Design an enzyme around this catalytic site. Structure first.
Site, PDB file in Angstrom:
ATOM      1  N   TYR A 299     -10.697  -6.140  15.149  1.00  8.56           N
ATOM      2  CA  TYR A 299     -11.989  -6.288  13.497  1.00  8.56           C
ATOM      3  C   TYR A 299     -11.258  -7.009  12.311  1.00  8.56           C
ATOM      4  O   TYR A 299     -11.687  -7.784  11.889  1.00  8.56           O
ATOM      5  CB  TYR A 299     -11.724  -4.770  12.786  1.00  8.56           C
ATOM      6  CG  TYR A 299     -10.357  -4.144  12.114  1.00  8.56           C
ATOM      7  CD1 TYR A 299      -9.709  -4.844  10.740  1.00  8.56           C
ATOM      8  CD2 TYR A 299      -9.260  -3.430  12.333  1.00  8.56           C
ATOM      9  CE1 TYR A 299      -8.698  -4.023  10.343  1.00  8.56           C
ATOM     10  CE2 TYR A 299      -8.442  -2.748  11.929  1.00  8.56           C
ATOM     11  CZ  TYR A 299      -8.232  -3.498  10.849  1.00  8.56           C
ATOM     12  OH  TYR A 299      -6.610  -2.658  10.372  1.00  8.56           O
TER      13      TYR A 299
ATOM     14  N   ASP B 111       2.980   1.589   7.070  1.00  2.01           N
ATOM     15  CA  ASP B 111       2.976   0.787   8.707  1.00  2.01           C
ATOM     16  C   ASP B 111       4.283   0.744   9.436  1.00  2.01           C
ATOM     17  O   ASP B 111       4.399   0.352  10.423  1.00  2.01           O
ATOM     18  CB  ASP B 111       3.015  -1.095   7.890  1.00  2.01           C
ATOM     19  CG  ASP B 111       0.967  -0.697   9.092  1.00  2.01           C
ATOM     20  OD1 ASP B 111      -0.051   0.111   8.543  1.00  2.01           O
ATOM     21  OD2 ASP B 111       0.015  -1.906   8.921  1.00  2.01           O
TER      22      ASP B 111
ATOM     23  N   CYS C 159      -6.298  -6.151   2.357  1.00  2.00           N
ATOM     24  CA  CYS C 159      -8.026  -5.559   2.796  1.00  2.00           C
ATOM     25  C   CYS C 159      -9.336  -6.452   2.695  1.00  2.00           C
ATOM     26  O   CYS C 159     -10.214  -6.548   2.982  1.00  2.00           O
ATOM     27  CB  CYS C 159      -8.478  -4.170   2.978  1.00  2.00           C
ATOM     28  SG  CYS C 159      -6.698  -3.106   2.894  1.00  2.00           S
TER      29      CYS C 159
ATOM     30  N   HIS D 296       0.817  -1.317   0.157  1.00  4.98           N
ATOM     31  CA  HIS D 296       0.322  -0.125  -0.225  1.00  4.98           C
ATOM     32  C   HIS D 296       0.625   1.584   0.256  1.00  4.98           C
ATOM     33  O   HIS D 296       1.152   2.133  -0.817  1.00  4.98           O
ATOM     34  CB  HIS D 296      -0.935  -0.042   1.071  1.00  4.98           C
ATOM     35  CG  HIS D 296      -1.966  -0.988   1.061  1.00  4.98           C
ATOM     36  ND1 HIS D 296      -3.223  -0.526   0.203  1.00  4.98           N
ATOM     37  CD2 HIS D 296      -2.723  -1.686   1.898  1.00  4.98           C
ATOM     38  CE1 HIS D 296      -4.388  -1.057   0.123  1.00  4.98           C
ATOM     39  NE2 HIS D 296      -3.766  -2.107   1.052  1.00  4.98           N
TER      40      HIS D 296
END
Ligand SMILES: Cc1cc2nc3c(=O)[nH]c(=O)nc-3n(C[C@H](O)[C@H](O)[C@H](O)COP(=O)(O)OP(=O)(O)OC[C@H]3O[C@@H](n4cnc5c(N)ncnc54)[C@H](O)[C@@H]3O)c2cc1C
Ligand SMILES: Cc1cc2nc3c(=O)[nH]c(=O)nc-3n(C[C@H](O)[C@H](O)[C@H](O)COP(=O)(O)OP(=O)(O)OC[C@H]3O[C@@H](n4cnc5c(N)ncnc54)[C@H](O)[C@@H]3O)c2cc1C
Lengths: 473, 473
Positions: free
Chosen positions: B187, B309, B61, B28
């Site tokens: 999540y 990240d 994702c 990403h």
């Protein structure tokens, strides 16, 4: 039903005088003001209310849904009534029009049961709204004396009050009414056009302007809406000036600039005018007659406020005083006036003219300035737009394309407005843009704004981010 | 597929130095950074890319959607590739891990085709991302030397890389795998729990925390999601610390400090940790090991940037440096690093950690801080919540309840976070709150924000307005 307790603005009574507060008008603005004053300061003030109508707290915004049979009936079209307001502590005078105001003696005179009723006040709040305008049309005249806007010609209609929608819906009963003409292609006319079409009538939408929803959406979106109506049998007659409504004892034909249409009913949805005559000139007025008020909704006369469609409001998009007749503004200006009249200093923050429209499954929302209106008003504006699917292409169901337009000031870089349109409801997204404009967010800052990503909800490079990043001007 | 031309941040090359820029990592963060640099400054700079994996530009994702068969395999889970990046002008080395950086000679050394390859740079951008968190669990270790997070115990899985899910799906083949334990109730763990359940397996969700989604939503809504998962057979084992994963040659049992569970597979979804080993002690790091960067994504070593990240980011909710491992942030930080690295002064504006989740038709979104989290950070925070239907009661179909929570600082009055839950998509609504937090809007000011009204879309006294007005502290 939509009640609650004290707002976060309510603060200690401390050492302020108790005030007798007279409110003139009790629809959207007046009701919001009254409820706020009573639920927050209750006993501390004496609230007296006057309304010339036989009904109050009516949801005019739902008339088209009712006429078009999108809802069962009129029941849910009222959010309060005389009884409820009284149960909050208000003294309510129905069918009692205030006919004069003495600002020196501080009294208002209303016709209560055919007699002059004089009421003293410490604070006066105008929530008188507006009235429908009658354009110069041959055959179109109002039967003098009707606070209900009744036309002399049978089947010629205005649609503002509850009675009007009831009167229209009633007449739609007889099979004699097969063709209806709607004059004015603003949002009210567009909604009405769909409603009559939905009732099975042949509709023709007429307006002297070259498109519908002018001033709210840019060309491609108004074109889209226009195409939307046409593909549902609505005939469009834009760029035409209505000259006359003729017929023998009833509506039978509407004649315009370049045509004649056989119709059995004509609805005038051209516009409204603020009801500010009670000002008697003592109060500063906006050019359209609206009571000129500051951010606390106070007029040029201390102690007298004005809210809703009878007054102005600050527009953060244009950054000037403006006049935006929306139920949304009616509620918020009513709340602001309530607190100030009760001794709590509360300064409003202006609005962006945010609005939405839904016609035959085509959903659109906008806030601030369209590119056209921005340019028309001297802004060195530009628009950045993008059309893309709401969700990642790999989502097998529930996806749909969305078109977004973000209008910004090429010079200051601030966002001036935005519009969104799609076949599914993404209206919640306009709230962000209303806030953006309010706060002066620039197109550059917006581009980097934290827009979350979840495959089921949106794309990583969602259309807001794409549109903002793609700003070229 | 999310390509575009120049961003609005690009500007005339003027009198600036072009330069040799080395990017380590291309998921990403790296991909967005590489594209922004090549698309906006292309020719003036020389971009070389290194990535130890055999595939880049992956949309991790969507792994849960992939695993649970909600989409057609990894079909559209890639937003770029080697060919696209090279065609844009970059030199790309796949399967080439950078094993050391010489900050003095400003050169990196990577293993290309099993042989060391040195590369000199003027600018260095770390996009090395994160690795799964692996607390002390007996029987759980990653094979020495694997750059793919392969566990030494058969059927013990991590889910981060493309191969990781292909591997899980591969294991899911044999009907022998009937029960799966998911460790970590954030999540990711919640999404994976549903994926395995959709695949017909018995699932037990284990977390040391007493609830799921801790730190994303308040107990109120986490309970909702907990019950939502249980209504589909998922077994919840909260308030338990996993101590060991055992079995004769493979997974057969998972043991916590409170219970023992018989399972055929274990998925560790505890969280992400910055992958910053290449710092070699030369770059300042955040309390969790992440490269400590400023608003320009620049590390303590001039000319050296860190994104996504592996680096920190400014959090406008806490108004401080933080670590928020999200693809949304990866993309935005990559864009900012790109421009600054290429001579364009671009100061980042921070994020709110906005996020969303959709499980078994339960849609939730939140941004900023929860009341619990705000309090855990020392904020004298308060929450104001409201539950009501999206539209007026008279709406025939398409209506549904929504619960909203707005967290704010009792002292400064600024909004710290917000959450929304419903079984219909209201996710676009969280964007306004993300922006509000970024702009430091107060609860008082938010209550008066211009929220449009259209019966087909919402209520005059909508739940956002009601919640704000209801602020009690
Ligand atoms: C068909 C239609 C659809 C609409 N749809 C929407 C929409 O979807 N969203 C939106 O935001 N807005 C909408 N609006 C606009 C919105 O309805 C108005 O902005 C809002 O009603 C204004 O409220 P108000 O209280 O200021 O004034 P008004 O509704 O005009 O009420 C004024 C009140 O004061 C009383 N009054 C006047 N003079 C006197 C007097 N002298 N003495 C005593 N009483 C007096 C009147 O009887 C009346 O009850 C729509 C309007 C129409 C006609
Ligand atoms: C199951 C799952 C679901 C998720 N869902 C969401 C979501 O819905 N919304 C959201 O916003 N975020 C989500 N995320 C988080 C998001 O995926 C991360 O925030 C994002 O991947 C970070 O991107 P990155 O480029 O910074 O790092 P990474 O994806 O970790 O990539 C780092 C890259 O650098 C390479 N690399 C590392 N070290 C070296 C080295 N020494 N030499 C050469 N190359 C190296 C790696 O091979 C890798 O390709 C999810 C994550 C997972 C695992």
């Amino acid at each position: 039903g939509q009640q609650m307790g004290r707002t976060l603005y309510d603060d200690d009574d401390k050492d302020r005088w108790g005030s007798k507060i007279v409110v003139v008008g009790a629809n959207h603005a007046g009701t919001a003001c009254i409820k706020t004053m009573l639920t927050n300061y209750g006993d501390a003030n004496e609230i007296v209310v006057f309304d010339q109508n036989s009904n109050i707290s009516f949801l005019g915004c739902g008339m088209a849904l009712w006429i078009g049979e999108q809802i069962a009936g009129p029941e849910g079209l009222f959010y309060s009534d005389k009884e409820e307001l009284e149960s909050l502590g208000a003294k309510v005078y129905m069918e009692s029009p205030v006919q004069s105001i003495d600002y020196d003696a501080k009294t208002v005179t209303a016709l209560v049961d055919g007699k002059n009723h004089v009421e003293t006040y410490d604070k006066l709040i105008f929530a008188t709204g507006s009235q429908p305008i009658l354009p110069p049309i041959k055959g179109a005249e109002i039967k003098e004396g009707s606070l209900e806007f009744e036309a002399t010609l049978e089947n010629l209609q205005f649609v503002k009050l509850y009675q009007n929608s009831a009167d229209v819906i009633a007449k739609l009963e007889n099979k004699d009414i097969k063709r209806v003409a709607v004059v004015g292609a603003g949002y009210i006319g567009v909604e009405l056009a769909e409603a009559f079409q939905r009732k099975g009538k042949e509709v023709v939408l007429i307006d002297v302007v070259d498109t519908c929803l002018a001033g709210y959406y840019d060309r491609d979106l108004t074109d889209l809406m226009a195409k939307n109506m046409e593909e549902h049998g609505i005939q469009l007659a834009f760029g035409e000036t209505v000259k006359e409504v003729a017929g023998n004892g009833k509506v039978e034909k509407i004649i315009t600039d370049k045509n004649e249409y056989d119709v059995d009913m004509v609805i005038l949805a051209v516009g409204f005018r603020p009801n500010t005559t009670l000002g008697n000139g003592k109060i500063d007025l906006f050019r359209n007659g609206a009571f000129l008020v500051n951010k606390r909704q106070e007029t040029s006369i201390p102690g007298v406020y004005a809210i809703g469609d009878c007054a102005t409001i600050y527009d953060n998009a244009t950054r000037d005083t403006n006049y935006i007749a929306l139920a949304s503004n009616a509620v918020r200006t009513g709340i602001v006036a309530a607190h100030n009249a009760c001794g709590t200093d509360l300064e409003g923050i202006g609005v962006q003219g945010s609005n939405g429209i839904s016609i035959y499954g085509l959903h659109m929302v906008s806030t601030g300035l369209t590119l056209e209106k921005a340019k028309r008003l001297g802004f060195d504006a530009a628009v950045t737009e993008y059309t893309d699917n709401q969700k990642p292409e790999f989502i097998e169901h529930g996806n749909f394309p969305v078109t977004i337009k973000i209008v910004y000031d090429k010079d200051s870089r601030r966002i001036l407005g935005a519009q969104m349109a799609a076949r599914e409801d993404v209206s919640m997204g306009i709230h962000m843009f209303s806030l953006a404009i309010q706060e002066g967010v620039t197109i550059e800052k917006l581009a980097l704004t934290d827009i979350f990503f979840l495959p089921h909800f949106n794309k990583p490079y969602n259309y807001i981010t794409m549109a903002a990043l793609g700003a070229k001007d």
